[model samples]
Target: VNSFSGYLKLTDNVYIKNADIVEEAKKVKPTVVVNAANVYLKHGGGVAGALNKATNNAMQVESDDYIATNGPLKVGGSCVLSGHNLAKHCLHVVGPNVNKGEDIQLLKSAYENFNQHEVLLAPLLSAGIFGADPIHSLRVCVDTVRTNVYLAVFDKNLYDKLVSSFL
Candidate 1:
């Protein structure tokens, strides 16, 4: 059997490791935790809120300052901030929302924006109320993501679906 520890190796350049987005985070401790964010970078609800709470809300505070300094990040854009109680840094990526009419390319752009140098913990994009398809999100990820990345899935069902992709 072949493996990168627990990671499921897919294509030659594609692989994934799964863990609870926050629980596993406290253990392996990535260089940064990636947030599936809105354009405002607000740590509102769902995955972002979980991260906001885990990092002791400091991530939200810095993001507020970041927004004040740089204004709102456009769709698929990203910026870095202090990781607070979690990793060394955090990367917030604004993904495309189906209801908002943003398309797959923008979501791909979000994954494309990851700093490959950082060991990253990222939630499965659009797996929440933002309403983009999970399958599409993973496919976009497989094609564009270029980093040592984990699918920081909070729910077991979503994780299973992603794991089912190449199995």
Candidate 2:
């Protein structure tokens, strides 16, 4: 059976003071980790709150310069990450939104901001915005991002949408 679980590995030293998901990312050390704030709604519950906490941690790491050149790190909104290269070097990417309506604009701005910072992963791509029917929105976002990867964490039902859009 195929599963999206365990796609990335985490580093033990990397950790989120008050976040399980962040800790998990730390354990695996992924280049980027799109944390879903959708627990009650889908995968995680109270994760959005945890992500917020991790965001603060990322900020601290950037501000204090405590983490070394080779330390584990996490970043929140794209804009925040774009503004700080020190933070970018220490941490991986973290995106929380699952919807693409108004969020699409934010995502676009974030990508643009990230681009400006030049801290982006080489093959950065579009992300899937979650909703009742997110295909069209996904298209707009993917088209807008114009990067190499599309972090569209979709359901089985949405698989058809991904393929149909490609066709």
Candidate 3:
């Protein structure tokens, strides 16, 4: 079993942590949690799915409303949902899809576009289900955040490996 559970500093304020995503969300209670949402805000799989499940699909309704009002989002664009179950707000970004090119720039843009907050939680953008390199994506996630950042990593082995690399 994995023994370590804490933050690994990536920058002065940014960090990566190996922990239960939902549990960490509760503890940190970030102002915003970035959801790797699809163009349609489906939230049917990966991190988005987990968020949707935890929020009792509250984010889904917000997604629907967002789409209805503003229409679909382009890659790198985002929308915000207040009163989310996990965080005070949820920032949904349309990330690179499986079929689209792995545009790290777009991913960076998505991260850059997020509203500033005291605390923010983010998954490895485009790395899990969207098929981007974990290490590279982690760097982008770390580089783009202007405030305290928490990376929610689910795999102990991956977290350990990343920490070792950083050290």
The best candidate by lDDT is 3
**Candidate rank order under lDDT:** 3, 1, 2
Per-residue alpha-carbon lDDT of candidate 2 for residues 1-167, written as tens digits (9 for 90 to 100): 21123322112111111123445444434334443322121222233334335565444344334334434332223312211221223222333344433343444443333333221221122233333234443444344443222132324445444555542
Query: Using alpha carbons, what is the TM-score of model 1?
Result: 0.87
Model 3 stretches astray by more than 4 angstroms: 1-5
Q: What is the lDDT of candidate 2?
A: 0.33
lDDT of 3 by residue, 1-167 (tens): 12224777778767788876776776666777788888888889888898888889888887888789988888888877873657788877776764576566787887775545666777777768887777877777666768676788888898888778763
Across 47-72, the per-residue lDDT of candidate 1 in tens digits comes to 88988899788888888998898899
Question: Residue 159 in candidate 3 has what lDDT?
Answer: 86
TM-score, per-candidate, Cα-based:
0.87, 0.36, 0.87
lDDT of 1: 0.75
**Which residue segments of model 1 deviate by more than 4 Å?**
1-5, 12-14, 115-118
- List lDDT for all candidates, in order: 0.75, 0.33, 0.75
Would you give me the overall lDDT of model 3?
0.75
| TM-score for candidate 2 | 0.36
Flag regions of model 2 displaced more than 4 Å.
1-28, 35-107, 110-133, 150-152
Better of 1 and 2 by lDDT: 1
